[PDB]
Symmetry: D2
Subunit: 326 residues, 4 copies
Amino acid sequence: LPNITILATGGTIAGGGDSATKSNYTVGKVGVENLVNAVPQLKDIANVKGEQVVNIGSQDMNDNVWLTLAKKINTDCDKTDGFVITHGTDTMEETAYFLDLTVKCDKPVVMVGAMRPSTSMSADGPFNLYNAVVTAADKASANRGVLVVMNDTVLDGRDVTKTNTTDVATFKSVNYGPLGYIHNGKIDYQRTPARKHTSDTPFDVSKLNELPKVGIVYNYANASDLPAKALVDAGYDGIVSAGVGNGNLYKSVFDTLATAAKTGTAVVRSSRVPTGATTQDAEVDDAKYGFVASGTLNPQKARVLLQLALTQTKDPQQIQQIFNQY
Amino acid sequence: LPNITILATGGTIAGGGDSATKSNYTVGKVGVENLVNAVPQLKDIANVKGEQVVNIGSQDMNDNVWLTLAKKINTDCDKTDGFVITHGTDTMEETAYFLDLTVKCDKPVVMVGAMRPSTSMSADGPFNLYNAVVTAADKASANRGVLVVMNDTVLDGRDVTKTNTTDVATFKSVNYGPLGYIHNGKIDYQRTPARKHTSDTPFDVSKLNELPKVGIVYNYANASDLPAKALVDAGYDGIVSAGVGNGNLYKSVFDTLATAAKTGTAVVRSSRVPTGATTQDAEVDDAKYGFVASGTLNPQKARVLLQLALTQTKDPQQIQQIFNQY
Amino acid sequence: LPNITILATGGTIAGGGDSATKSNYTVGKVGVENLVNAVPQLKDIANVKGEQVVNIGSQDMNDNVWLTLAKKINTDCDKTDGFVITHGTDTMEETAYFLDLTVKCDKPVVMVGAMRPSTSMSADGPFNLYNAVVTAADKASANRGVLVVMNDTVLDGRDVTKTNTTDVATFKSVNYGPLGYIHNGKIDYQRTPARKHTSDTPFDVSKLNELPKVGIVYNYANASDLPAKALVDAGYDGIVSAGVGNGNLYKSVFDTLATAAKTGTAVVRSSRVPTGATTQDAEVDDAKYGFVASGTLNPQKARVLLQLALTQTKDPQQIQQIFNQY
Amino acid sequence: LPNITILATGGTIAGGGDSATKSNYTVGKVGVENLVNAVPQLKDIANVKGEQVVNIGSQDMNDNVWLTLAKKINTDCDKTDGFVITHGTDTMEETAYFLDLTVKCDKPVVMVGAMRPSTSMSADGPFNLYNAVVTAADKASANRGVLVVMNDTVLDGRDVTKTNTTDVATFKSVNYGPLGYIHNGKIDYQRTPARKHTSDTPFDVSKLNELPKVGIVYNYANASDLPAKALVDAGYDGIVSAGVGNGNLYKSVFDTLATAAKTGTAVVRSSRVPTGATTQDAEVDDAKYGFVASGTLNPQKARVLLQLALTQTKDPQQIQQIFNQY
Ligand SMILES: N[C@@H](CC(=O)O)C(=O)O
Ligand SMILES: N[C@@H](CC(=O)O)C(=O)O
Ligand SMILES: N[C@@H](CC(=O)O)C(=O)O
Ligand SMILES: N[C@@H](CC(=O)O)C(=O)O
């Protein structure tokens, strides 16, 4: 068998309910150990070693945890065959993409959570954990980047997102589809990311204790400029716009961000629209204004890349090239 | 043939670039009487009369355009057999729901735009416009609320949303599906909305000059409390949270919005997740904090309803009731 | 609490296996009183009585089970407050549509199965059944036709189909979407079917021992006419063509079915394509050949309706109208 | 500018009706000279050579057209820089997979069609054609397999399928998603098919003038054995079974097929279910009865692979192997 480490961070997968009938519950009661001691079948597929890193709802996920997850993984690379990260579902797609850009252990890194509490009828957690370990142990999983494994499906960390608020089938790669499917403890990979990841990225967080400050502002009919102005006033390093349609902006927000972009703030145009690319060559002349278009990166995911871009450069043209590559 | 009034507001639908192949276009350029003439086949299904209300990209849509439109429709109600509104696609989903809650005319009101400019190859707007007049002229279209017609589909104002940044098929009713499909100038209707709309709402905008101020804040890992603080300091009537997962909030945003709610700001919890409801009895004790769960309403649609609700009440209790009925 | 009757027919929901992480299983094996006993939370929402009808895999479902089911619900209607039918997943969409047109009880009638064996890890059966009883118990579920409840979603008998071979989220209403979602054992209904069902149909099976023979043939490139020829020669009362695109047929198949239409056989054009309507007034002149367009009814569903159609009439115009109403 | 050969085979893209608004049309009557001419913007991206092969609707596609096409592409290979094939949409997903297996040429082959006839009001053919030539001319499109280019999307020949009967966005790669998206005449490829293709397959058809005979039977409730029986009694080389759920079979059809398989007729189990794999080690024991499992190949595509498999072999288990690799 291969050697698999489970790094826990909390989530519903660790969370406990009032009873079997209710999804009013608390997030993150239990640790790595008895997520295992509730799925004895793991003994048949892996040598499983579990360690607690934090115990939180992913809605409170932050840069500190990302830094410590990355450094951990980059350090214990060669004491294990692969990693599984138990995590809340809410911000799983952010963590996954951050680790997809910062981990250099080319070994399998898989993330997993649960949409149902552990104490509920037909709790997804167990079989989800089974299948993340499978993906982690299978050696075909390596060099594909950081993974999310949910509902018998293996998804790439860059394209994966939470598409539904309550459904066990929420996680999908909405633009380019999944990498593989899991039936009977086996995977059929028919796809791999072309965007560079893990050890082909230039990002180094090994010495960092904080990350550049990047916020997100939302666009809509009659949008206030007040949220954009508070991020500039507080000297934010970057701002991602969750634009309307193809990264378009309400004029008031446009004006403020146009100003911010010529005054030491990096501006990435993303979209509130859940699928498809925020392109160049449309309604907004990015060159004139010094903005960067995010492509298929949603706001949250754009934020992740922008922070990392900003650990290297503050020039928009080079941030655009970075957005064209990872 | 029935009399159809086209109210034009702008959009790509009235767009046009410097080329048929190139994507670079300007919106709100062509006049309504031109739009009509590029679709003479209109001549055989209605007596079309065009009126220009504004000529803008819908990224710049605002409360005044909404109020103008609703007042125009309610006033001219019984001098026409139905209405079409030509509109950009970026915030069509917001206008549509606005009019769904404020039009009293029980004749059909159909909104329509185009993902590709008029000058473009295989332009979508012509047939979109035709189908939208077919919808508006159909007597079965009446009593279904305000409709959006795009890509041979009839969709309800409440559930319709833009799912894709560039695809002609972007508009979908993502939670409950379309009302009907259009083939050969005819509709087979299999669904009507069950929530109260149009003439059954208490919202009366006929004497109203402004709407209560509602802003939207976004949640993500390490989210700043500054955007939300800026809205509270400006004395906002309501705030809509674009939450993570089932309407959850980053801890520092939670704190600012809790505080706002005790000082008589409406706070609605919605979700950045494109599908599914933000429910009560999840992780957040709505009753304690005086919050409202938005249901299947996404943030930009929650704002629409929250502004109108605020014209009747500021009791979160009654606002929740409205969010459960409209 | 309401008296709910469970009518069991088989399926994986009732079909065990050897180990929890091996996807082998035998189907239709456990009895109704075991299923009920395995879910004690039932006792909090309903007084549940089980009756075994059959115990097969749904792949082996047949006209005789369908007639027993309908006659049973029609006799026992007034002894209970709602029915649930445990049933295999493979042809649940066929049976649901059959009962949708023949049950005369307007009390809730809910079907349910399981995509995973009841012994496997994170088995859907127990929660699936609870939600089905929740729906059968909810009075709001009356007058909506026959329902399929799977994955916290209530779907109408007519539009519902299996979209995926293994996924627990397989059942969707792919043309018009769900009626309602379930959360914390409560249902928000936003939709009901417009097409007529249950007691608003003329089908009366109370004294039928058999149904008209209807068979389905597939179309593809270079398709054999042979299968259509074999059904003709055994004297089939009707044939449904799974066509290509919009109900189109390989020439050889067309001409056989055309001959047969002249010799009193009912011919319905449907489509191998999973979503969308087989329409009239495209490439096939149905009037000329005595053919019927199925609309959004896929081949196996189109079959159900043609069988029941044939218990009233043989005229192609009347069958078309039936196809347009039910 | 690159040299692009267009091989026209017909389709709605070469179809036409009496009126822009009326849906009745006839297929494959517009010549390639007139198609090309209807897109003058072609000159700007290629030097295009129009060659008619046949002018049929793809409902009548057969083996002889497939062979004329393969041969013509391998022969004409070194005289051109890429291939575009105008076709009908109804079987495009069959032809695409056949050509994907038999073209030995490494240059790009791109299939294109239209869902609306060229006379239709917002005809998709002219822009679709342009995009086809873009994909064909982009040098990064090389080495990906045979492509289908519809609705601004570049889809691979193995996974692409028609999901809807009338919608312009009907072509999707429903299990593993698309290869790239086209904006503004350029393509960002993020994926490539893993399974083998074009130059890297065993199959040569340079000299074959006939392909083995392979038919498809459909499973459903109370399904008839007569179609299956008809096909063995004609001594068909192979039978594909569109099964219910995970390739399950009605009892009487199971028998007639068990027979066929271990008396020298090959039998692939596929599924009527539009997505997901017909897997081994579920309900049926494939090795015992001598059945091949089709994986994520649907019936029509499994037939393409099985036809071609039988040029090389007849043992079940080497056909199972071709079904794990191609
Ligand atoms: N709030 C939870 C939700 C979940 O895990 O399902 C989390 O993200 O930690
Ligand atoms: N910016 C445009 C985009 C479109 O119409 O497609 C609008 O006004 O929404
Ligand atoms: N073959 C089974 C599958 C299931 O029940 O899920 C049946 O249809 O009975
Ligand atoms: N029946 C036509 C449909 C189309 O081309 O859109 C064909 O496949 O030839």
